[PDB]
Symmetry: D2
Subunit: 199 residues, 4 copies
């Protein structure tokens, strides 16, 4: 119960490893905001967390949209009174589509690049002043070439966030991830900010 | 006069090294399309090229917009009958603004990332079928972390463009650039595609 | 306090940040082997640690020689009964002379690369079986491709509860180094930290 | 045809792609020094080139030994009157054994790194003053950080009209290599090509 009475937001938590991050946080006492572009999936995971004796709500977010990220943060405040943690796991999985850049749909490509590269930026901007008001916080960026973008972003934000007691780190890739993520959120990772963990 | 009766497009050619690329091409006999987000600057450079005994027109392009790139290509066809070369030099110079990602204007950041990372993609898509119809062509991408994006893009496009006799290469940084750029466009660089030149 | 009953070796600790690591380990309770190519400087640093109320000895080592690294490890085991930690900080002061690869003395060039790239390898090889008998251990490499060495060794050391990480560079460094050796860093191996 | 009146050295040309480079250079008119640690294989390849109507000799060289690389260069100069080109392709067949850094034989490990990383350095040092007397030259390194070596050497070789580039890997390779040596590649130095 490391995270008792803490508040964490996990983007892309409607499924996959994001869901496991959300569930693990709630298992250890945190109020979790289950944020996903898919509302129904997010609500499904939140409902199971609550049925399991946890605290969670779901929220629809478009991580590529700064205002949708802001709304996610304001909802978390209204529902839980503060924000301690943010896990930027939301991503667009493209796979072989990006092998055909000459013919790929422009709007798909733009959304893919925007979510995967800037998603963590908009969500970080949406939470960091609220965290500061809590006395500090911790953020984890889940990376996915181009993953140097999130590595670069993580180093930059780590410096900009200095003096707020806010740490920010990146994980670059099976419940060893979960263990690593929650560790990077916890107070035992106090010496760690601006670092990239290869998993 | 290596480029006599050839047709080349240079984006970001309203000033700086792009202007020198445009002027050099026209000096060696090519019909040059002087493409820039700034119409007046582009027209100024085109007017001097014509006054110097060259062949050139100016065109306004937003390289982040696939349709503006298409319009640039169609104008070149209409004006000169074909497209042999494309120099992707258009870029947003941000400098110290990107040291303040927490507070940077979102629309500025999006435009900066879109022009610098995807500009070469949209312009390449706009010209490659027209080049194919010419019997081949050559493209140079001018890179500017994040410059791995244009390096990656250049390698990917090089493979996708195979079998069209179209070469594509990247330059990553003072008229040695000009020399290198025109060489990479010329037939003597036939062995070179998908490569990055550190200048 | 924090490293009570632990035994740590620090190479290149006859001066600079290596000395600082050794002194920090000893003040937090560890028995420390001050290892350096410079035997006098190492002994002087060991003597000051002991004069300041820590436990330490000195050992002369050439980290470019696998047999010298072994002897360093055997001495530690004989002196303190085990090995828990290794900090690979040994380094040759090669700098702007690597701008002249066309004229640099070959034997110096090789020695430079050997110490700075292979030093950590030979010392890790010297201690890893001893650490395995203790039930695990932690290694920190001071950094280049010595990051790749750290990733590779981390995979090779698996199943032994031995962690190995790198720091790419003062109290910031000392703090990070001790953290990476501590049980708090149990989730961390095969990583490179920029301090 | 294309390399008429030119003199080129290819290391590691007793087999593999090294042989292919040497044979391609000779069929295009160059006098070629087939250099290899394996003296018999080098001589056999030299003999076939000459039997096929090219000009070549063999020389035994250990590219890890700076003095052996010098002797290779002196022989070339004495035999053909100058040096224009060097292709650094010498390499030791080390593979999956580098997955066992904890147990790999130290002397093999060092030799492996010496040949594969330093081979190109010692050979470049052996030829660059000779190339300068000829009015320039071109060097190709078969690739890692040996890219950094190529960038560094390119800067150090400035003002001599000597170009040095790297290829990171069959007829594709041969073509690229000969192009990088030709006068057509005059705009290219300190670059790494992926073929």
């Amino acid at each position: 119960m490391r995270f008792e009475n803490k508040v964490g937001i996990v983007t892309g938590s409607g499924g996959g490893i994001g869901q496991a991050y959300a569930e693990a946080l709630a298992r250890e006492g945190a109020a979790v905001v289950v944020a996903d572009i898919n509302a129904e999936a997010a609500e499904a995971v939140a409902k199971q967390i609550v049925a399991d004796g946890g605290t969670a709500i779901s929220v629809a977010v478009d991580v590529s949209d700064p205002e949708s990220a802001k709304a996610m943060a304001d909802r978390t405040l209204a529902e839980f009174g503060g924000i301690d943690y943010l896990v930027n796991n939301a991503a667009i999985f493209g796979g072989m589509k990006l092998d055909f850049l000459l013919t790929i749909d422009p709007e798909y490509y733009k959304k893919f690049m925007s979510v995967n590269l800037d998603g963590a930026l908009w969500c970080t901007r949406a939470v960091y002043k609220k965290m500061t008001k809590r006395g500090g916080g911790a953020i984890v960026n889940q990376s996915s070439l181009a993953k140097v973008g999130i590595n670069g972003l993580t180093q930059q934000l780590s410096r900009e966030l200095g003096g707020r007691n806010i740490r920010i780190n990146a994980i670059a890739p099976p419940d060893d991830l979960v263990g690593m993520c929650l560790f990077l959120l916890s107070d035992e990772a106090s010496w760690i900010t601006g670092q990239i963990f290869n998993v």
